[PDB]
Symmetry: C4
Subunit: 381 residues, 4 copies
């Protein structure tokens, strides 16, 4: 059937998680322990130290800021680069729980639900997975292409300023050949520094989609069980517990990464809005800044939506198996459904380092914070 | 009895939902499939494309705003017009769930409650339905009458400016006959563009009133059941489940429409307060602006009140059938009432695209946001 | 014993509720229907129409405000006077539920609790009742005395300005005898206009203290029942239901009154802080303004504290009868205690017209709002 | 084993609680009533009256502030000193509940958990206890050393201003020997005034760590009980009740102390940020101000983290003993686990005088308040 398709996609995500330079863990379809090969183990470490030296250069470039304009110009790139740095460290540390996470979305067969629901669930999962992957991929590729190779293409068609923001360097980088080779190094570094948080967010969104479909199939399984004693209820409770444990495993790495992401993204959005609204931009950097805003807004909105859907499906699992059949069932079923409802009243939520809950109302509150601190940066001039 | 009266009113709402130009669905009292007649199917589509061309004209009129005054003058009408546009699209898409919604408030007989309560419930439902319909109808009619036909009447009694705000047009519309025919076209377009969200909000308020009366009759049915085994409890649980499913059906269309409504209404209120407080208005537009504020405040307050009443009645259904009889009942009743209370602890709330819950505290928070952004528009001058 | 003392105090509150001019209802100790005597029925109506004409004079005095200073000077007195007006109307309308409220705190004997706890409960109730009554009484009397009879005493010891803020009048009230007779009329009107909300708030605080002691005795009764089957649990459930119904009766009148009180009190606090911090006060009105702030802060803090204590005692009633005895009890007790805990998880809260919950965190949020709008009034100058 | 180690540390905390001058209560390892000896009873009272006279001097130094700069300079030290004053009073009053608190963390053996978990729990408890104690100790010692003995060392190496902020005194303290002896008295007073809230916060953090480990061992005990009837469940319920009562005992003293701490700490942080960002500091006080900020931020973050961990462990105790075994257990176990889950749904939270809940989101909200009132102090200049 089409199920063989889904594994194919959870192959490709693993492959792209090896492309960006994350630490190579064992994916499901490796029975010869090729994740410990020295080739990938030096490739990942080389990309990681390239990432660290580039992020450190752009970070110490921020501390040597004379005016507020150079600081606000370094804020955006330093924001995204330390986001990718936190993502690199958080995926290096927990290279064991990612094994369990990729073992979850490889076999997840819910026992009890009808097949006519399961096929439509697999179709919806495939469609939403492809949409979420391709949208961020296309937007990120076009944003990198503009932001890095538009002023270089302008100069190769035609006091240069090929790069957007300046950073600390050993040499002067004002003389002609140095600026070109630094621009090329910035291009390859920004490839390997952009594609890591996009890959992590694609994996998070795939996890959330699979968990939403698991919860819907669990609700249908409870209904089809109640429509008809022990074994179906035990399998339902076990699948509910597996969903809760998988969300608890998802919580930690993305808690640290989400705290860093949301704070630094709010700073980057405020700085970009100030540069677009106030200063005299030279029309070459504007296709970079108008796509970087769209990428950031799309990323925040998709993360908040696929985090809200899981809590909504849990609270809808609270209202499962509640009819005249429940009043006419035995005491065993009437106690087990009560236990399931009591445990399902607890919400499955992702917290960003326990400072906030990733919901859709949090996006509105953060948009209010952005709009409050945008007027301040406008009035400071 | 008087029950034949209530169906009459749920006839008229359907009729007014065909007047404003919504897509014709099958109401309860049609057994010959006359909702698929070509007459209404071209009437609705014609009013809809008139609405879209007028809203698009007023929307591209906003983007060609030189000063901040013309932008803030276009904000109010563009706000209301894109509200009506979102309402038109959301009622075109879900023309199947409106069938179920009109099937709900056509037969809703609760089994178990005494008749002496049911007659008073029908009287209260009729009174509050007539009040909510007639108040918005009278205020909207007087607001349209002032806002559109006061400066035209001033000119026909007596460098013209017959319309309030300017919009993009192919011609110049400054020469005399063009401005009059554009004013007449604006009059008929503003009729068909005002009466659609008012009709949708009347239908929402009728739904909320009927659901509140359903919940009160369910509480009385639980009390009269406990005062006296299987069949009454099964009918109670089934009616509770029907109420929850009907609220879940109400949630989606009004979620999208409420997000658009509340955001654009906050913008319109802030702009109107700035124009009334600061600038030198020429005393002809002031009867339009002082009625548009009253309509917006009345609409927001009635929506928030009839959304809060349902949650309050659900949490009061939690405290139903709790006396010394519950302690002296069997284990079947003591488990079924416990299941009803556990399911009733979940609140029945309407969310606006999951960004906020439509409550009465949200009206206070939005009034705080309005008061915060009114002082900013005053200080910007 | 000392219980005969408590009834004495719930006599006196009723007497003071007849002094301020509220509509005379039947208190507990009247078996000859003397609350329908014509003497009190004309006394209350006369004080009420005096209140309405004075509040209307001070309210139309606000609309004829040229500068912002006269408006901000009328804001405080118009605030308190329309607070008392809303209190007068809300106590005229619900003159039937006050019968039930005074029937509650006249006999409230909890069955099951030990006597050694009940005597200490009555001592604590008497002490806190006397403290809450006498504090507001002394502060209100000294505030009225300063605010009304300090500039009159200054003039009778010694271009006059005997009253603090001016109001609309038929005559000019600038000539000498008119200003003195208007000051005397203002004195007696401010007596009858100050003592009504203070009396209502004393009655609310007495209700909250009695309900807190009822909840504590209910918790001790549950513990002493579980330490030892049917009758004790039935009496416990009945007393819990009586507490919930009494709080539901308290909710409505104080909901409307609390919405008016909290909004108008926030306005009055902001205006008083602006007048004390910025302008050149002539040192005679300062003992009025420094006592009016203390009265308002004391009133808000005591209302919020005695509203928070009830919710805390309910959530502590959730943790009642939970030991190794519950694990060793029968299924009847293990189901009834579960039902009591499930119903006790619902909080007993007082909402101000459903816009906010009267808690102690709401006092902090309102203090933040006051501090935000105080800086604005300072910067406007 | 290593358990003998843990008692050693709960000796030392008691010893440091006698060093700072708190009222001497009976610790666990005193069987001869040496806490009522006259030596410690005069030592504690002498340090307390020294604390009160120093805090009163620095408090009346604040009221004689001409400019806003001297007031904002006195705000920080008066903040910390009245924090220590509230801590002294709150530990003098409740010298009886501290007996119960030190009796809790002396024997807390959970019955049912495996030993392999308990040894790792004791190791984690020892490590986190040593970390939390030593971090605050080292930072506080270096902060006192800089803030008090840096300008004195500068003068003894070399119109003086040896102390940071001035306070009221009987003499002039401008002449040379008076300023030196006042600086020495300030040194010893700031030792005895700094080490008391640090000691109280160390005791609070030790309590929170022990309670978190107790809750984790309780969850493991529930799992190991369900894996296998009466006695294990009774011991589990008794340990849960002991945890709830111990948190209720912790609530009161730290409620008053936390309200004072959080408010005065927000004021001190805002004032320090204004002095570091705006004015021309003379480079000697900057090592005091940059360490005082780090101490305050570390204290607030550790208190909020170890208050959030307990609520998270309680809500994780809600999901305890929920598998296919629960569906296959008897009605006794299926009712007792349901009662445990219903009681565990209530959160174990520490409230600061019931105005706010000490969580990690409250730290974010208070950081927002700090950032809001820092810009105001910058713009006031
Ligand atoms: C300099 C920040 C990296 C970056 C630049 C432009 C973008 O569009 C983008 O989104 C992927 C990322
Ligand atoms: C231009 C906005 C349409 C409009 C104008 C005036 C109103 O009173 C109104 O309420 C129905 C709507
Ligand atoms: C003019 C407002 C009435 C009023 C004045 C002063 C007060 O102290 C007061 O508290 C009872 C009330
Ligand atoms: C004057 C306030 C006392 C104080 C000063 C500096 C510090 O570092 C500190 O933390 C313990 C406390």
């Amino acid at each position: 059937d089409d199920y063989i398709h889904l594994r194919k996609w959870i192959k490709r995500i693993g492959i792209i998680l090896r492309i960006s330079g994350h630490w190579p863990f064992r994916l499901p379809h490796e029975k010869r322990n090729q994740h410990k090969s020295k080739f990938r183990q030096v490739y990942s470490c080389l990309v990681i130290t390239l990432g660290f030296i580039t992020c450190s250069c752009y970070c110490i470039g921020l501390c040597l800021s004379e005016s507020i304009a150079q600081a606000l110009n370094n804020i955006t790139v330093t924001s995204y680069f330390l986001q990718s740095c936190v993502c690199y460290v958080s995926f290096i540390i927990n290279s064991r729980k990612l094994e369990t996470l990729f073992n979850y979305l490889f076999e997840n067969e819910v026992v009890g639900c009808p097949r006519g629901y399961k096929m439509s669930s697999i179709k919806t999962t495939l469609f939403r997975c492809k949409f979420v992957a391709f949208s961020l991929g296309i937007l990120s590729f076009f944003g990198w292409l503009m932001w890095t190779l538009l002023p270089l293409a302008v100069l190769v068609v035609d006091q240069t300023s090929l790069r957007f923001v300046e950073a600390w360097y050993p040499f002067d980088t004002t003389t002609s050949p140095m600026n070109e080779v630094i621009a090329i190094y910035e291009a390859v570094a920004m490839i390997f520094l952009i594609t890591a948080p996009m890959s992590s967010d694609i994996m998070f969104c795939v996890l959330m989609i699979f968990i939403v479909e698991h919860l819907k199939c669990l609700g249908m399984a409870i209904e089809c069980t109640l429509k008809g004693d022990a074994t179906s209820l035990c399998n339902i409770v076990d699948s509910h517990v597996k969903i809760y444990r998988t969300m608890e495993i998802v919580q930690s790495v993305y808690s640290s990464y989400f705290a860093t992401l949301f704070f630094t993204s709010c700073l980057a959005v405020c700085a970009l809005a100030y540069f677009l609204a106030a200063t005299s931009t030279s029309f070459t950097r504007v296709p970079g800044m108008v796509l970087y805003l769209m990428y950031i807004f799309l990323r925040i909105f998709l993360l908040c939506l696929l985090a809200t859907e899981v809590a909504e499906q849990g609270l809808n699992l609270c209202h499962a198996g509640y009819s005249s059949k429940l009043v006419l069932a035995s005491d065993h079923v009437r106690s087990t459904i009560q236990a399931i409802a009591t445990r399902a009243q607890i919400p499955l939520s992702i917290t960003g380092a326990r400072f906030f809950t990733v919901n859709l109302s949090f996006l509105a509150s953060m948009a209010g914070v952005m709009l409050t601190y945008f007027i301040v940066l406008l009035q400071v001039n």
